[PDB]
Design a binder for this molecule. Structure first.
Ligand code: CL
Ligand code: NI
Length: 103
């Protein structure tokens, strides 16, 4: 299937987005001029980005790259360099945005 980024927040705001499909290419996450806009106090203008790249068989590989000074955690570990995501991974951006990556 397409990879999904699913919003795990228990009380998401009306403006807040519950589910994104991660499309082929770069999805930029942040506040100012991004493909996914998150508003929390700790979300930087350019927070991080997803890369979706195809394999020989069509199956996709999604990586997450954090931006300088923008905190993101995958399964509890702060991610500081780019990282290949896996279905089930829990991603927190800033302190107020929790997702699951579902492939
Ligand atoms: Cl935040
Ligand atoms: Ni879907």
């Amino acid at each position: 299937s397409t990879p999904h980024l699913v919003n795990l927040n228990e009380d998401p705001l009306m403006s807040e987005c519950l589910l994104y499909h991660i499309k082929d290419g770069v999805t930029r996450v942040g506040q100012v001029d991004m493909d996914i806009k998150l508003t929390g106090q700790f979300i930087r203008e350019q927070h991080c980005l997803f890369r979706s790249i195809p394999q020989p068989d069509g199956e996709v590989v999604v990586t997450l790259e954090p931006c300088e000074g923008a905190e993101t955690y995958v399964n509890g570990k702060l991610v500081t360099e780019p990282l290949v995501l896996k279905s089930g991974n829990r991603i927190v951006m800033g302190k107020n945005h929790v997702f699951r990556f579902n492939h």
